[PDB]
Amino acid sequence: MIADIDITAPEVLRNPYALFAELRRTSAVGRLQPQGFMAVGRYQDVARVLHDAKGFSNRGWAASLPRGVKWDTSMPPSIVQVDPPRHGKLRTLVTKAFTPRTVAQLEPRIRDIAHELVDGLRGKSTFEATVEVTVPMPMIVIAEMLGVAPERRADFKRWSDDMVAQLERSTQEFYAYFSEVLEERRREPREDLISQLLAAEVDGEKLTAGEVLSFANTLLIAGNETTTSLIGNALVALTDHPEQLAAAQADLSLVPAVVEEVLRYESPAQCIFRQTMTDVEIGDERIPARSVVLPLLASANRDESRFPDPDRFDIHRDTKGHLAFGLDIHFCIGAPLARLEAKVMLEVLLARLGDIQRVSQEVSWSPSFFIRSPSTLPLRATVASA
Ligand code: HEM
Numbered sequence: 088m089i090a091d092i093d094i095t096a097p098e099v100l101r102n103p104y105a106l107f108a109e110l111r112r113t114s115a116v117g118r119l120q121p122q123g124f125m126a127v128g129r130y131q132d133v134a135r136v137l138h139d140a141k142g143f144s145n146r147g148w149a150a151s152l153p154r155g156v157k158w159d160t161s162m163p164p165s166i167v168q169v170d171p172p173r174h175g176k177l178r179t180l181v182t183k184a185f186t187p188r189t190v191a192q193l194e195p196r197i198r199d200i201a202h203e204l205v206d207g208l209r210g211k212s213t214f215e216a217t218v219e220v221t222v223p224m225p226m227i228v229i230a231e232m233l234g235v236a237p238e239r240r241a242d243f244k245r246w247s248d249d250m251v252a253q254l255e256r257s258t259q260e261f262y263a264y265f266s267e268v269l270e271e272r273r274r275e276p277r278e279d280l281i282s283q284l285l286a287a288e289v290d291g292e293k294l295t296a297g298e299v300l301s302f303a304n305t306l307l308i309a310g311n312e313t314t315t316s317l318i319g320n321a322l323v324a325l326t327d328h329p330e331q332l333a334a335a336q337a338d339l340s341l342v343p344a345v346v347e348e349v350l351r352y353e354s355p356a357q358c359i360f361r362q363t364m365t366d367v368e369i370g371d372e373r374i375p376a377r378s379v380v381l382p383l384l385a386s387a388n389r390d391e392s393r394f395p396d397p398d399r400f401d402i403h404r405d406t407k408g409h410l411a412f413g414l415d416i417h418f419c420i421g422a423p424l425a426r427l428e429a430k431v432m433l434e435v436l437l438a439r440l441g442d443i444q445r446v447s448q449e450v451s452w453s454p455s456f457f458i459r460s461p462s463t464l465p466l467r468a469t470v471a472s473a
Contacts, residue, residue, distance in 0.1 A: 089113045091120045094456035101452065103357060103459070104398060107386035115370025124150070124379040126358070128386035130393040130410075132369050136361060136382045137414040143380060144170050145417060147362035150379045151457070156255055159262065163297045165305045167417060174416060180294050181302045182420060184283035190424045193228065197428060200227050201435035202473040209470045213446060216322055216464040217315070224432050225314035228424075229306055234272070234279025239264060251312045258304075265303050269296060280306075306421070314425045316355035316460035317346070318432050323461060324349050324400050326445045331402050336437045341402060346429045348402045350411035351394065357385040357459050359413060384410045385459065440468040 089110050093099065099106050110117045110128040117126040127133055136143050148168045152158075166177050204223060208214045226247045235243045242260065249257035268281050276282035284299045294302070325332035325345070335341040358381040367374050374380060387410045389397040394404070412419035419425070436443075446465035453462045 089117045092117050092126065094119055094122075099456065100454055103385065103456065104389050107383060107389060108398075110383075111386060111390060114372060116372040116374060119381070122379070124381050125374050126381045126383050126386075127369060128383045128390075129370065130387040130390035133382045133384065133387035133410060134414060135369065136380065137410070137417075139367075140171060140416055142364060142367050143361035143382075144364050145174070145361065146170065147360040147379050150362070151360050153254065156258075159259070161297060162262065162304075163295070163301045165301060165308070166420075167305065167309065171416065176289075176292065177294075177298065178416075178420075179289050180287050180292070180298075181284065183287035183289065184280055185302075185306070185420055187423055189232070189280075189283070190427060193232070193424070194427060194431065196231065197224075197228060197431045198435065200224060201432045202439075204432075205435050205439045205470060206473060208440075208468075209472060212469060213465060213467050216466050217319060217461060218463075220432065220436070221315045221318040221322070221464070224318065224428055225311045226307075228428060229310055232280050233265075233303055233306070234268065234277055234281055247307055247311050250308050261304060261307075262300055265300050266296075269299055309419075310421050310424065312458055312460065313355045314421075314428050316458055317349060317425055317429045319461045319464055320353040320355060320459060321345060321349040321429065321433055322436075322443075322464060322466065323445075323450055324352055326443060326466070328400050328402075331400070332437075332443065335402065335433075339434050339437060342430050342433050342437065343426070344406070345402045345433060346426060347406035347409065348400060348404060349429075351388045351404075351406050351409040352400045353459055354385040354388050354409075354411045355459060356411065356413075357457055358383045382410075384413070439471050439473065441471070443468040 092106065107128050110126065115127065115129060115132050117128065119126060127136055145168055148165070166174070166181060169177055201224065204220050207219060226244060230240055230243045242264065246257040246261045265281065269285065272282045272285055276286065281299065281303065284294055284302060287294060325335065335345050361380040361382060363374050363376055363378045363380060366376050388394065391397050393408060412422040444467045446467055451462045453460045
């Protein structure tokens with residue numbers, strides 16, 4: 088039933104949109120079993136939830152955290168777990184460092200990274216797109232933004248891979264290293280994000296050291312797997328829609344639109360987390376106080392109410408108002424960076440690769456309801472040099 092949703096079901100992992108459509112048709116609210124989490128599927132309702140920060144707290148994100156893992160309790164929580172009024176203070180501080188200006192200025196380096204990744208494909212007629220392209224790009228870009236020393240880049244990869252007993256070690260090593268980095272940049276700042284986070288000051292208030300480190304950590308967790316997902320999902324959508332791929336390969340100015348339609352069609356973050364603070368009502372369904380609630384961004388983005396023929400992938404549709412990056416106060420800080428990495432990587436892939444096909448018609452999706460991404464994506468294509 089819609090009151091007995093099993094996210095482990097192979098059909099749900101394969102095609103969650105069938106469940107989502109059934110939920111939207113049936114009820115404003117669904118229930119996951121055995122987690123007991125409440126799911127909200129209709130576009131208007133998802134938007135209402137995200138705009139209602141007083142009724143739907145971000146402390147719900149605590150429900151997503153891996154059990155059996157010891158957290159350094161001197162580390163403040165991720166910004167994504169914080170509610171007003173603390174949230175606004177923190178967000179205004181971190182976005183003095185992680186700014187649209189700093190993201191836009193990365194584009195030349197991002198293009199170079201894209202070209203180097205495609206250089207690794209030369210002389211091959213098949214490649215595995217995740218390991219060779221979509222997984223490295225976000226991780227390389229964020230390590231450069233954070234000022235990671237060249238000799239610590241492989242440790243950073245390992246930490247990144249582990250965050251997608253081992254997990255505890257990687258988290259401890261991440262913070263040990265960035266603590267050291269933070270003290271070095273207090274002495275001699277550079278142009279990197281740690282330096283800029285340390286400098287930030289608003290109304291004579293500054294981030295604590297814990298807050299700097301916690302935000303650094305958030306950027307890996309928040310940014311890597313989701314951006315990887317966007318690029319892989321784009322490759323899946325384009326290979327499923329040959330004529331659209333063909334169109335974009337002939338006109339690279341389409342790529343921003345491709346990216347927006349993948350964001351809507353195969354939303355990387357399929358849902359997010361909230362917790363009700365009171366008894367609340369959505370679409371005449373009451374949700375008890377203290378329930379974990381999953382606003383189903385992916386369901387909202389495929390809601391016929393908002394997006395006509397929503398199961399049609401159409402790079403020429405109007406994508407305005409999709410909720411892939413959320414909405415309102417917690418709207419993705421990384422949204423310009425994700426959009427830029429994806430545009431640049433797809434511009435380079437599309438320009439340099441000839442005919443692109445999947446090896447397999449079947450996509451092996453990662454076994455996550457929460458993040459929609461290919462576990463592997465073997466592709467057939469020929470490279471043309473940069
Ligand atoms: C396609 C890629 C991405 C998607 C789909 C995505 C999606 C989202 C969503 C849905 C939220 C809102 C969470 C909420 O309301 O609880 C969010 C928040 C956030 N994302 Fe992203 N994101 C992506 C990439 C990035 C990247 C590249 C970064 C940074 C490098 C990043 C950093 C953040 C941060 C810091 C927040 C928290 C903002 C806050 O709580 O105020 N994200 N993301």
